[PDB]
Amino acid sequence: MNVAVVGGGISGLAVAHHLRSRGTDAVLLESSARLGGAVGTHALAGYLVEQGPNSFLDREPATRALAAALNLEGRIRAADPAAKRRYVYTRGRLRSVPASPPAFLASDILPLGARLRVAGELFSRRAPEGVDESLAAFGRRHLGHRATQVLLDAVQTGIYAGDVEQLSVAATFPMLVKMEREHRSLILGAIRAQKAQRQAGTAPKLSGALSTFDGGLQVLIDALAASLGDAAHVGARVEGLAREGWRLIIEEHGRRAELSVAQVVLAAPAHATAKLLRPLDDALAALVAGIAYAPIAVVHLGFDAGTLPAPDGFGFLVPAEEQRRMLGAIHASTTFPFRAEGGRVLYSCMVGGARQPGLVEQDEDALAALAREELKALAGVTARPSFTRVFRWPLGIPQYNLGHLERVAAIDAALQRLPGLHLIGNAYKGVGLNDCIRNAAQLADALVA
Template identity: 65%
Template sequence: MRVVIVGGGISGLALAYGLHSRGTEVTLLEAGPRLGGNIQSRLQDGFLTEAGPNSFVDREPTLRTLAASLGIEDRIRTADPSAKRRYVYTRGKLRTVPMSPPAFLKSDVLPLGARLRMMGELFTPRAPEGDESLAAFGRRHVGRTATAVLVDAMQTGIYAGDMEALSVAAIFPKVVELERKHRSLVLGMARTQAAARKALPAGEGATKPSGMVCSFDGGLQVLVDALARKLGPAARTGARVVELRREGDGWRLAVEEHGQRAELAADRVVLATPAYVAAELLRPLDEKLAARMEGISYAPVAVVHLGFAPGSMPPPDGFGFLVPTQERRRVLGVIHASSTFPWRAEGGRILLTCMVGGAKRPELVELDAAALVTLVREELRELAGVTAEPVFTEVVHWKRGIPQYHVGHLARVAAIDEGVARLPGLHLTGNAYKGVGLIDCIREAHTLADTLTR
């Protein structure tokens, strides 16, 4: 069996490696000049920056298992313990996000009335029929204020989206399942944790994932480079697929590579590209399927890195802060990159990574680099009191950054799956469908590799 994968982001790379390691003949075609998609780690002027994903949370073995098989597990680094502290900008200042119920009751992150309303979560009614927005789900469980501040800040850090439009079942399926089984999230979490403690054999607690924020010592690019080394010539860059058509029981792809056009035969084809790219290739085969895929929107995001000289400002505390939409600010959030991972800035330098735009302020991503640096410096001064002059700046524009799983997304994906099933030998993977995170993409790629090699 010969498999051709179109798209060299983390989904395509993980799938190609999974097939290659199982002995399957695989070719990966990436239209751009490099592999890794939006994973790009750069070391410049003593600062290690990430253009896309900044880290991952070690909650399940998916990524560690892959890293171990690649021989790079020892390069995984956990965040500084101070990174457990998170902040949200609300009511005119940065406030600590409490990490336990007692701390929450004593905190000022929400007004007293909103904190008391959250205690009423135990009495939340059952979910209504049909898909529900994250905002509606949040208001039903924790109230309007907590939803506008904490729930919105949480989704902003992942999706940079509009919580009135995002589908809670699509973006937080485990939370919805918890509600389905237990009605109250508080009751569900308590019961689930108690059952887990009871089921855990003695002495095995230390084998659990750490739950810590992690990265690699050279950035997430370490993972991409390790996958590329294992694949060798099977992964080709500068190879753009311009046509996809059925041929007998298989497929034929027209590929433009290094100024020349050639054709490639395959028994199976996997499109691991953004949904809108896959839609263009599939339009001649199924117009309705292509339209459904194009219906998945993307939030634009600009990533602005600011580096500061040693001693020019106090090192910021904790992981960083998020800004709820209701504050009407121009930044989505700020990661204290050098506080979270001290090795990302040499010799006491300080690195801040700032996000701008998202679904609610897409026009800001259209600003040029200089304007974005000015904007971010103004916001940092007003929100966090940062007045120091940066010695390093870097701006990355993602015009189509993060897929948005809007209400109806699960039905859309089910319809897409049905359409793809009518094209035997064709498969889809990537962050547009069943999880936007790094680990989501690797998990889905692993599952698809198992399916293709059964």
């Protein structure tokens, strides 16, 4: 009858909520003093600043179903007035990322032969057979070297803070690999997909717009916390589990307690879930423990109204070949004007990632100085900030590197030999908010069986 959920980030919260909304009592245990995990918005100095995540793409049904179940649909906010441009630092300046194929062919984002080579994606050679090919290898084959170096590397940085040479395209971009399987060429697949839809409606159509909530993504967290209420325990570290069924040893209020449930859902990060799995299956815990994370810091810089202009666009990204100490920045106030009061301008700068993890081990003063130097060199920002807030995440973002899918497949096969045990979270089948929520609901539905 009962389920324990371990971990209270978006995945754990969404699993417990979906179980309870279908009449399965779930208890959730969070080791921290607060729910949310990576998600957290802070009201400071006239800003709403985001701990980690800033937005979701309003294209996932599960996230809309969850907002509806939580009476949040009217609190969903779209991606700013202007602010539809993306920039990439390449060849000495911030350069606008073209949004259409005709704008791309006329653009200076890449040299002429390299743009012509992107059009030659029509003639892409077959994928290597039976090979878990990298993102960078995938790009060279489809796009050319220049487009991969600067453009695909940028896209990858904004989502995973990873290494383009190490990421599995099949794990990181399932839909690109599927289109490749069906159509070889991505351009061909798109032409054909447009033909298909243009040949022949109850619920409203999802815009795919870059979205958040009126008070940040904290609104979603506060709402899950209020929905679960007593069923979700804060400052409850799980330090053991074993068969009996399933018994959890919990450390709440500085003391030991025990809990007995029919089924356990582990929604903690790979390193923490591996620690719990070790006494049950050493080989399984090693698989789980082998999932790499990339460290990441966010440096928020607030500016008094008038001291600099409002930066155009959602933000910018910087390719690894540029050999810079910053990954990119939002443009938080341009994108979402409600997250800053009285004309104040907020940048949220991202530092670290897979290729420079050591920068995240620096102190906040040094990270703020780094962000200011880089923002000067790349964006031309000379003004002095009146606000500074640094968050460091050095358990960082899961890296779906070569061999990831076969790892997760072997993680799944080991879980079958352990009835009533289940994994969920950003480590396995999707890093983003939307993936976590969709995967969370899908597990919850399958448990009521």
